[PDB]
């Protein structure tokens, strides 16, 4: 990781993971899906 660059790989990968669609499952059989925010990316 480097600070010379515009943006650092850390915030970019974290942002891309936050942007992915997350699913939250509760079995017994509920499964919910939700889209993630892009605000970090």
């Amino acid at each position: 990781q480097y600070g010379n660059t515009g943006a650092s790989i850390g915030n970019v990968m974290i942002g891309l993971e936050e942007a992915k669609d997350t699913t939250q499952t509760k079995a017994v059989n509920e499964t919910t899906t939700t889209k993630g925010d892009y605000t970090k990316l």
Partner: protein, 50 residues
């Protein structure tokens, strides 16, 4: 005598005053131009942008 002197001073300080017509002219000519063009790129699936 002093009377005849001050009347000759007053006579010459009483003259008519000419009057000037001052006409200014202000000219302001501006001009501007610009051309801004460029191509950007992006892929938001794996975030990569130009």
């Amino acid at each position: 005598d002093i009377m005849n002197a001050m009347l000759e001073v007053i006579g010459q300080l009483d003259i008519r005053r000419a009057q000037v017509l001052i006409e200014a002219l202000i000219v302001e000519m501006a001009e501007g131009d610009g051309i801004n063009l460029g191509v950007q790129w992006g892929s938001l699936e794996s975030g990569s942008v130009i």
